[PDB]
Structure formats: C-alpha cells, structure tokens
Design a protein around this nucleic acid. Structure first.
Ligand code: SF4
Lengths: 255, 204, 184, 113, 117, 46, 161
DNA sequence: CCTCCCCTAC
C-alpha cells in the first residue's frame, strides 16, 4: 500500500524481503517525519494512515478522528503533544516582523540568550499567531489547534482518496449522585497518588532516600520532557479545582 | 413499554446464559457467577465474558424485544453438529404477554424471575451431561403477522443508526417450518401483572 | 444472634460487633454506581437484619468508598437503604455508629485503638536490605507493630499513608496516650 | 470406486478455464489479476455522498453493508421483487447469524487476555 | 406443629422453587431456633420421596462452624457439640437470597438499647 | 466414625427446647462508648 | 409458474457460484465477494469476476430450465484430478405468488451457506467440477432445506465419499 | 503575486 502526495512526499508499508511478515512504516516528507509541528499531529496522521492501509475502512478512521476531536474539545489531552519546536537563527532574520513565533518567544524571554540554531519550544496552548511558551504550565481554544494543525495535512492525505475531513470535524437522602461524586473523587485521588509514587521512585536516583524529603524534592522537578510531569501538574490543579464546591454539595446532601 | 423492556431483557439474558452454561454449549471456564452485567440480575447468574458472544446475545435480545409486538413464542434450540438435528428445545411462551397498553415495583418482578430461573436450573441439573467439542445452539421464534427479508426492495437509503438497525434486524431472519419420542416438561413462569410468561422445555 | 450456637448464656455476652474496614471490594479505576449500589444494598440488608439484636460500629477501609488517605472520615448518612433511615436520625447512636478509620473506643473504660491496617501494609511494601536476623511471616508483622508502639508513631511512612494537611502543629498520628488494646 | 451417477445420466461440456489459467485469462481480458479492496465505508450511515468529486476526479466509494449491495443480476439485468409482500398468519422464523464457535472461545480463554 | 411447618416447607420447595432455611421457619411460625431445628429434622424424616438436597452444618469445639460437603469423612467427630440441618436446597448450587425481614417479635436476643424515633 | 444420619438423629432428637420463651428475650450485655460525645475526636478532619 | 423461472435462475446461479467459491474449485480473489446480495441475505455472496465463466453458467442454467420437465434430478459433481473420482456431490431434486417462492429460495440458499461454511478446506489446483442432468462405498449424506410450498417441490442434499 | 522562513529529499 502506498500514497504519493507530491514530489519527495510519500508514505507506505515497506517489505524489504518476501520472508518479512510485519510491514515497516516508511514515510518520506510527510508530517510524520517533519519536525515542523506537534507530536499530536504526527501521532494522529500515523494512526490514520495505518488504519487506512490495514483495514481500508473509512468508517473506522472517521470514528477515530471524531473521538480525538471530541477529546481535544473537552480538554482530555495530554497537554504535552501540543508543543512546537523549530530552529531559530537570531541573526539571520531580515527584519523583526519577518521573525517566526519562536524568535518572538525567545525575545520575550531575553528581556537568558540562547545558542545558535536551537530547537526551542513554542506555542504550547492558548490577535495574530505572533506565542506562549510551555508560561502555559504556570498560566486552550481547541478549534484553532484542531483546524490549523490537523485539517490541512489530513486533507492533503485524504483528498487523494476523495473525502473531506472538514465535514467530519464539523459534526463533532440521595445515594445516586453522591456515589458518582465519590467515584470520581476517589479515581482522581488514586491517580494522583500513583503519579506521586512514580515521581518519588524516579527521584530516588538522586536522593537515594525513601521517607520524607524525597517526595519534597521530587515535587520540585519541572522537567518538560516527561509526560509524567504534565500529568502530575494536571492532577494537582484538578484537586484544587471546583471539586471544593462538589465537596460542599456532598456535605449538604449527607446532612 | 416503560419498564417492561428492561426486565424482559434481563430475563432473556439470564435465560440464554443459563441455557448456554448448563448444556455445555460453551466451556464452563468462560462463565463467571455475577449479579451485574450492565443490569442488576435477579440472582448470581453465570454470564459468559467472551465479547463476541456477549454482543451476539445482546443483539439477539434487542431484535426479539423489537419484534415482541408480533412474536408470541421464543425458542432456543440445541442442534448437534455431526447432523443438523435438534435434540433439546426450550420454549418461552409469549401469549400476548399482557402487553402494557398504558408499572409495578421491581422487587416482585425479580422474585418471580428468581422462581422461574430456579425452576429452569432445577430442570437443567438433572439432565445428562453434554460433551464439549462442537455442540451448538440455535434461535427460533414463532410469529403471528409479519414478513421479514422483504425490506431491501427499495434500496433502503439509510439516514441514521435507527434505520440501519431496522434494516439489519429485518434481514437477519429466515423462514423455517414447524419441524417421535418428544417429551414435554412444563416449567414455572412469571404470574406478575405486567408480565405473564409461560415456560416450556423439550427433550429427544 | 444466637440462632446457631443455641447457648444464649455465651452469645448474650457479645456486647458489640466491630467491622474494621474493607466492607466492599471493587476496582475504583473501572467502576459505576449500579454495582456499588447493589453491594451497599446487600450491606444495608445485613445491617438491618442484625441491628435489632446487637450494636454495630463500622470503620472505613482501604478499598471502601472513602478517602484514599489514612484518616478516613465516617462514610455518610447516605449510601444505605431507606430501611435504615430510623437509625440515622441522630438520636440512635448507641446501636449504630459510623466512625473515623483511626479511633479510640472507650469500651466500658477499656481504651482500644483500631487501625484498618493501611500503615503496616504500606510499611510492608518496602524491601529493606537490613534486619538479617522472618520473611512475610506473622512474627515479622507483629514486630513491626511493636516497633510502631515503641516509636509512638502510628504511620512511620508518612509519604505513603498520610496525605496533605494532616493537621496544624499537632499531628494526631504521633501517639499521646498508649491504649489498652491495639488492633490492626 | 466413486459416487455413482444413477440409472440415466447426461454430462455437460467441459468448462473452458482451469485452476491455473483462470487468472491469466482474466488478466488477458483486461481485468487486474487480484482486485484489491478500494477504500469503503463499513457504516452506510457515514456514506453521506462523500465521493462526489475531488479536483475534477470522480471517485466511486461504496459500502459493504447489505443495504448498499446491488442484488445479484441474471443476464445483465437486475432481479428484484416488485409486488408488496403477502404475510401469512402463524409463521415461524430462524435466526441466520452464526454464533461464535466453541473452539474460538476455548482459544480465547487459553490465551489469558 | 409438624403440619403448618411441613406445608410451608413443601410450598416453598415445590410451588415456588427456592431454598428454605430454618430461619424462615423461625420468622414464619414465631418459634425459637431449637424448635425450628427440631421441625426441620422431623421434615427430614417421612421423606420417602426425596427431591431436594439437605445442607447440614455442624458446630465444633473452640467455636468453629463448618459446612459439610464430603458427607463421608467428617473430621474430628468427637469434638462436635451440635449438628443440624441448615436448609433444604432443591437445586445443586445453594446460593440463597436475602431480603428485608421484620423481626418484631421473633428475636431471641435483643440489645440493651431501643430504637428511638 | 458414623454416618451423617446417625449424628443427625443423635443430636436433633435430644433437643433441649428450653429457656426459649421468645416473649421475654435475654437482654444483650450493655457495652458503652465513653467517646461518643466527649470532645475533640483527634482524627476528625474537614 | 411465471416468476419461478427467474427466481430459480437466480437461485441456481447463486448455487453454482457458492459451490465454486466455498470449495477450492477456482482460486479465491477471483470472485466478487463484497458487491452483490443474493436474496437479501446478510452474508456475502461471491460472483466470479471472469465474464466468460458467468456466461457459461448462464447458458448452463438456461439449458437446464429448457428441459426442466424431463429432468427429475440436477446435480453437480466434484471430481479430483489424477483419480477421476467424485469426492463430493451436491444434488437438488427436479396458486403460487412472489413471496412464498422467494422465501423458500432464500431459506434453501441460507441452508446451503450454513452447510458450506463449516466444511474442511480444499487444496489448490486439485479439484474440477462436472454438472450432470438425470432424465427419466462409504457415503456421508447431508439433508438440506428445499422448497415445498410450490408445485415444483425440490429436495436439497449433499454427499461426501 | 510577492518575499520570508523552515527543512526535507537527492
Ligand atoms: S521527571 Fe517525570 S519522572 Fe522524573 S520525577 Fe519529574 S515527573 Fe516523575
């Protein structure tokens, strides 16, 4: 199976030997191998291409795309796969207005200076496009991300078949409620505890300690290259979220 | 049809799962005793955990519930695979079911279901053991005024999932006929107001 | 209730019944309200059928629908069948009592400290390359509990059992008075 | 040795193609040797008349559902029922879908998912 | 009474197929546990047409309660302090069901406190 | 040492049937909790 | 007796194509499997992609129905190469409105599909067929559903050496 | 339509 988009742009399953059983996902020039985007678009494109090549089913692709779009709109994304990274040349720009978004982010950060030809994180989440750095975590309009990150490449890949992805995206005493409240709160608390345990175990590498002052040190880690940090900060924010009002509602119902 | 559909679906699920388990239609290791299978069962009914079998049973029960307005008898036939002959037949009478034209507490409904399922289990226990290795089951219904397989003569351009479900349910049945030492053993059904169900069984 | 033993002279001496947690077991990762409600209705049926003959004290457990931390508050007035609404009016507390997970009952002057066992279980999830001179034996856990009394710290592994904000300047988990009887 | 034909039996002509020459003959006629599956919708609801056109190219995207499948035609002309169905009282019907095999369930259980 | 109890047991065992407990006799006839066990033993006799399974349990020493399964080799028969019939099971799997029971006047032991409304 | 029927006959036929008036049931021994209302449950948080 | 001709033609075409595909008489990926519906059945009915074989089948069906009165048994035999022995043999014996003839044809086709789906696989390039018309060792016989409402009652059964 | 910028293929 193969798709030929344009010159030096193609993707397909490769069989280097007839004895080989599992196909190899070979892509050249499409967004999967291009570092000019976000990991979410690469993962979505790869999954859609694999589904099309294996099952040839457009219904499964549409279902997966609609589910992913709904998750993005709701806000159930990992928040890490939405970070851009492009090289910046601080001295090779003709003018200030011609500089890219990452140059503006670095210039705001300087006022510290980076090195020449650096992949720098830009446009994490949430009026020209010219720039929040991953200021987001200490700080998303899903329509913008969905449309201007997934509609163009998926349309380029699927208009060859003859389907419009944009049409798919266009559609897009009480023991009952309190029990659900406890279910949600306990699931959130257990997830938070698991994240804290993982962080403590990872920080054991440096601390070599198990009791107190190990979790305290692990709580000060701000590594942006690991999804566990994003999950931990999301859980911590959610514990301090509107759930306080939910707890008050449970107290009123219980009384 | 307010609460009748849910209780009827639960009873049909328990009936089918009990018949499958006690006649060795599927390996007993694939069954587990439980009370919740997306619905609070009246007892601890052994329910298979194979996703394909669960989906098949749910689809069959939904089709039967959809056609309930015209079917007066539901039967699960046990047919051998060395030869296409039915050896055991379990008949679930639906003599107008006392249809709710216009509804009772769930406790009595579950008590009656418990009595009927206990009668079924007691009858099934004394039956001789059935070997594994390709014993299978079959579903047959007796209708009053309907004709299936004839809804695909207009190209049936579907618009929503309901139309597709109707088309696939109309075309999922084929016409059969009525067909020694047949032994008939009547069992205990439900005598509650909304649900009047009679239970039968056949041997040989 | 004395229905089985048939010796009332000994059954009538059992003043109270104490449930020390883990009333219901479920996977909180994948669970819905209906099956948990079925389990709680069964528990409420048992309570209603046992309450008129004996008093019941209930403790939250590790897998019970209560806080994941160790100081688990009493369950609720809800989560029980409507047949038990008479016991929850507030005036009837000597026959039914929902209590915090760690508690000190003064049973006829005998102060007893009850723990559902989360602290010892959390200590036992650590492998310590020390104490060469038992492996997963009753003696080893008994020694751990004896050390817990010796250290006057109910929860030595604070990051595992304890949660954020146990208290302000006075942690209740540090012992202030030894009890007569210790239960884990 | 083999199965007897009967008392009086006649035989028809030999088929023109064999097992090995069928694909070559099909390729000679102008058809691909293997007709690979085109992109399709398993759910007829999701059809929505998508394959209309794409940059001046007309695509034929169909569905494998029973509704969208053309009835088997004889002699180049389709065959279908025109008159309304006539239901008869006291009929019996049989489920057509095949339940999962005993061996399939045993294999699924032994894999320990 | 050996007549009302037998009729009730026959009804609950044959008309509506459900296992019958001695506690059911306690709640129905308003009798003590010993009388219920004696009535169950009496119904166990005069049973030439046996169409049910008896669930018998015994009380050992050191306050131990066991359910008999083998029915051929009972360990420590010398330490048995009591042995009776717990229920009559018309099926093979016991699996009883429990419902709300109003123990208004069938209680043999009551707590010192009373429910206050 | 004997069949189950022998044990059932030995035990059930000699039932006491005594002290079971059922009209004046034996009162359970009184056990109280002095901490029901005293003060300051240490583990009661908000 | 008017529409029975067309419905029998369609049923016989489905019969022949199903026998040719489910058995390994002709290779797979040479039949049209996901395009046609036989009798509104939920299953996939295969149709041979080569027009010449389809035309030959149609001529065979027309010839059979031309002398339908004289024939009392129409059968298709499976012959294994290098032995010339009938491994298996599928035989069908011989006021009516649309609905009934349509229904028994649908039921007979469904029964044939059920019987054929659970048969053992057949090796490649080892089987050739032979259609025989009848005018007037250890054998395993299987009884299938046939039409009975119409005056042209047929009996469907299969054999296996 | 124009330049500017990114960066992958060969
Ligand atoms: S970096 Fe990722 S893993 Fe290492 S501690 Fe911070 S979160 Fe846990």
């Amino acid at each position: 199976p193969s798709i030929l988009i344009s010159k030096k742009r193609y993707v397909g399953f490769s069989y280097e030997s007839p004895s080989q059983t599992l196909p190899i996902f070979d892509a050249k020039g499409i967004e999967t191998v291009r570092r000019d985007g976000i990991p979410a678009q690469q993962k979505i494109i790869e999954k859609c291409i694999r589904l099309l090549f294996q099952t040839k089913d457009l219904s499964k692709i549409k279902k997966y795309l609609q589910n992913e779009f709904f998750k993005i709109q709701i806000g159930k994304v990992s928040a890490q796969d939405f970070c851009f990274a492009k090289e910046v040349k601080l001295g090779a720009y003709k003018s200030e207005k011609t500089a890219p978004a990452g140059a503006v982010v670095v210039k705001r950060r300087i006022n510290a200076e980076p090195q020449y030809k650096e992949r720098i994180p830009y446009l994490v989440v949430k009026q020209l496009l010219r720039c929040v750095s991953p200021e987001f975590l200490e700080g998303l309009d899903s329509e913008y991300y969905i449309n201007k990150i997934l509609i163009p490449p998926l349309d380029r890949l699927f208009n060859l078949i003859g389907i419009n992805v944009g049409n798919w995206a266009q559609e897009i005493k009480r023991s009952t409620t309190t029990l659900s409240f406890l279910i949600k709160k306990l699931k959130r608390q257990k997830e938070y505890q698991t994240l804290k345990t993982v962080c403590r175990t990872c920080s054991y590498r440096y601390t070599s300690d198990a009791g107190i002052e190990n979790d305290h040190i692990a709580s000060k880690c701000n590594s942006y290259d690991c999804p566990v940090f994003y999950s931990r900060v999301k859980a911590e924010r959610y514990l301090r979220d509107n759930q306080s009002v939910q707890r008050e509602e449970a107290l009123i119902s219980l009384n | 049809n307010r609460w009748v559909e849910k209780w009827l679906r639960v009873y049909l699920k328990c009936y089918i799962n009990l018949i499958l388990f006690y006649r060795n239609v599927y390996p007993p290791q694939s069954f587990d005793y439980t009370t919740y299978q997306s619905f609070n069962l009246p007892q601890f009914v052994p329910i298979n955990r194979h996703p394909a079998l669960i989906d098949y049973i749910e689809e069959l029960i939904l089709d039967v519930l959809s056609k309930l307005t015209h079917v007066y008898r539901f039967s699960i036939c046990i047919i051998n695979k060395k030869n296409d002959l039915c050896i055991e037949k379990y008949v679930l009478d639906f003599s107008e079911l006392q249809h709710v034209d216009k509804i009772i507490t769930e406790t009595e409904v579950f008590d009656e279901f418990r009595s009927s399922l206990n009668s079924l289990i007691m009858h099934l226990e004394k039956l001789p053991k059935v070997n594994d290795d390709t014993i299978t089951f079959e579903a047959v219904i007796n209708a009053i005024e309907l004709e299936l397989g004839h809804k695909l003569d207009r190209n049936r351009r579907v618009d929503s999932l309901e139309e597709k479900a109707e088309i696939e349910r109309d075309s999922n049945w084929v016409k059969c006929q009525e067909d020694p030492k047949i032994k008939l053993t009547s069992l205990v059904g439900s005598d509650v107001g909304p649900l009047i169900i009679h239970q039968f069984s056949e041997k040989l | 209730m004395g229905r089985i033993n048939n010796k009332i002279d000994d059954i009538s001496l059992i003043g109270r019944l104490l449930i020390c947690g883990n009333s219901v077991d479920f996977d909180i990762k994948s669970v819905n309200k209906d099956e948990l409600m079925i389990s709680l209705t069964e528990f409420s049926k048992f309570l209603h059928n046992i309450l008129p003959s004996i008093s019941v004290d209930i403790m939250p457990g590790t897998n019970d629908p209560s806080d994941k931390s160790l100081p688990q508050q009493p369950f609720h007035k809800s989560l029980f069948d409507k047949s038990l609404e008479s016991y929850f009016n507030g005036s009837n507390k000597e026959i039914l009592n929902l209590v915090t997970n760690p508690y000190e009952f003064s049973y006829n002057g005998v102060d007893v400290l009850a723990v559902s066992g989360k602290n010892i279980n959390d200590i036992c999830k650590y492998v310590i390359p020390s104490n060469d001179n038992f492996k997963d034996d009753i003696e080893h856990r008994l020694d751990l509990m004896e050390c817990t009394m010796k250290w006057q710290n109910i929860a030595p592994t604070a990051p595992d059992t304890l949660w954020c904000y146990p208290y302000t300047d006075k942690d209740p988990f540090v012992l202030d008075k030894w009890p007569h009887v210790y239960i884990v | 040795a083999g199965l007897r034909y009967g008392k009086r039996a006649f035989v028809y002509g030999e088929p023109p193609f064999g097992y090995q020459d069928i694909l070559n003959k099909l390729e000679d006629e102008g058809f691909p040797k293997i007709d690979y599956k085109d992109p399709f919708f398993s759910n007829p609801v999701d059809l929505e008349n998508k394959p209309y056109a794409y940059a001046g190219k007309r695509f034929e995207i169909s569905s494998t559902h029973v509704s969208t499948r053309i009835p088997v035609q004889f002699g180049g002309e389709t065959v279908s029922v025109y008159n309304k169905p006539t239901f008869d009282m006291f009929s019996s019907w049989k489920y057509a879908l095949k339940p999962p095999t005993y061996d399939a369930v045993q294999k699924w259980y032994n894999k320990v998912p | 009474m050996d007549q009302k109890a037998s009729y009730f047991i026959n009804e609950k065992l044959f008309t509506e197929v459900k296992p019958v407990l001695f506690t059911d006799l306690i709640h129905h006839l308003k009798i003590g546990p010993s009388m219920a066990k004696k009535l169950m033993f009496d119904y166990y006799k005069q049973t030439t047409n046996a169409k049910y399974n008896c669930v018998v349990i015994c009380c050992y020493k050191d306050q131990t309660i066991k359910i008999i399964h083998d029915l051929s080799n009972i360990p420590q028969q010398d330490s048995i302090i009591d042995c009776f019939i717990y229920a009559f099971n018309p099926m093979d799997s016991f699996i009883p069901y429990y419902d709300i029971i109003d123990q208004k006047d069938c209680l043999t032991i009551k707590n010192s406190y009373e429910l206050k409304v | 040492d004997l069949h189950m029927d022998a044990l059932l006959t030995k035990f059930n036929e000699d039932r006491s049937l005594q002290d079971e008036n059922l009209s004046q049931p034996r009162t359970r021994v009184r056990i109280v909790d002095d901490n029901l209302y005293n003060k300051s449950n240490p583990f009661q948080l908000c």
